[PDB]
Swiss-Prot record:
Compartments where found: Cytoplasm
Keywords: Acetylation, ATP-binding, Cytoplasm, Disease variant, Immunity, Innate immunity, Kinase, Magnesium, Nucleotide-binding, Phosphoprotein, Serine/threonine-protein kinase, Transferase
GO MF: ATP binding; interleukin-1 receptor binding; kinase activity; magnesium ion binding; protein kinase binding; protein serine kinase activity; protein serine/threonine kinase activity
Active site as annotated: 144 (proton acceptor)
Cofactor(s) essential for the protein: Mg(2+)
Disease: Immunodeficiency 67: An autosomal recessive primary immunodeficiency characterized by recurrent, life-threatening systemic and invasive bacterial infections beginning in infancy or early childhood.
Portion held of the full protein: 165 to 458 of 460
GO cellular-component term (any): cytosol
Catalytic activity reported: L-seryl-[protein] + ATP = O-phospho-L-seryl-[protein] + ADP + H(+); L-threonyl-[protein] + ATP = O-phospho-L-threonyl-[protein] + ADP + H(+)
Occurrences of domain Protein kinase (ranges): 22-287
Protein name: Interleukin-1 receptor-associated kinase 4
Amino acid sequence: FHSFSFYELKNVTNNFDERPISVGGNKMGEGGFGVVYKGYVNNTTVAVKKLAAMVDITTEELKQQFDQEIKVMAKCQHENLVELLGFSSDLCLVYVYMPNGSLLDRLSCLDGTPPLSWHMRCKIAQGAANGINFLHENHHIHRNIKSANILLDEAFTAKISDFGLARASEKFAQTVMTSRIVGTTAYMAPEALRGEITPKSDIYSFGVVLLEIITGLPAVDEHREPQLLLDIKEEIEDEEKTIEDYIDKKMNDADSTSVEAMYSVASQCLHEKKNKRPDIKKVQQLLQEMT
Ligand SMILES: CC[C@@H]1[C@H](F)C(=O)N[C@@H]1COc1nccc2cc(C(N)=O)c(OC)cc12
């Protein structure tokens, strides 16, 4: 990886211009642990993520995720993984530019982009599953699978991002002692919330992403019934509603059999008991057969 000086990263991002792209600024996105800026360097467009405490998190904790991202990215290069180009040590990571942003942005139709077709959503789901299969074959657990961590290039190819929490070893990691767990709780499996590290947790989180794809709704919304998206599984199983009641209205090309087929996959991924979920290879097979 290339070691960029901090000052030249400041230059190429128009002095880290935090105005949106619309008004001629460089801000592309924001999360709990940083802001992502569009940059121009070496006759190319790049993305620069500058780490910062936007939510409650310490400097030492951010430095750990910075070092972990670089260690994992050095071992993991794949069609369905975002490519790290370099770094600078504030702490900056530099990536290949993804012009179609995150899956979350595109499902919300941010900045008046047109809705994703059913067929495009199926191909993105397949791409993301192939990304997770690479990681699991190479004995990695992502630990932060969500629509904001699925990026889209010129061809709408799915690229998994954010490897700051990724681990190379399985753990039970539960005692009567107080502990600190990091993650996005709206996407997290029961055993993941309690602190267990297993690839079976990545399957559950993928299940939540499949529901976002079907419904076009965010994983959590305070001003909604239900607030958690994964709760609709019970609503449908109790025959109180159907999947048809939750399908994204903005889709016109979603045949019932194909949508029913994807919900069944999502339902299996969202089993409370981790041993009762399909493995990633079974998820790949099922997605391929219905598309
Ligand atoms: C701090 C924000 C977090 C974190 F960055 C992440 O992995 N997911 C979140 C959203 O991030 C992004 N949102 C919109 C657009 C984004 C374009 C790029 C890009 N390479 O062009 C990007 O690269 C990494 C991240 C982008």
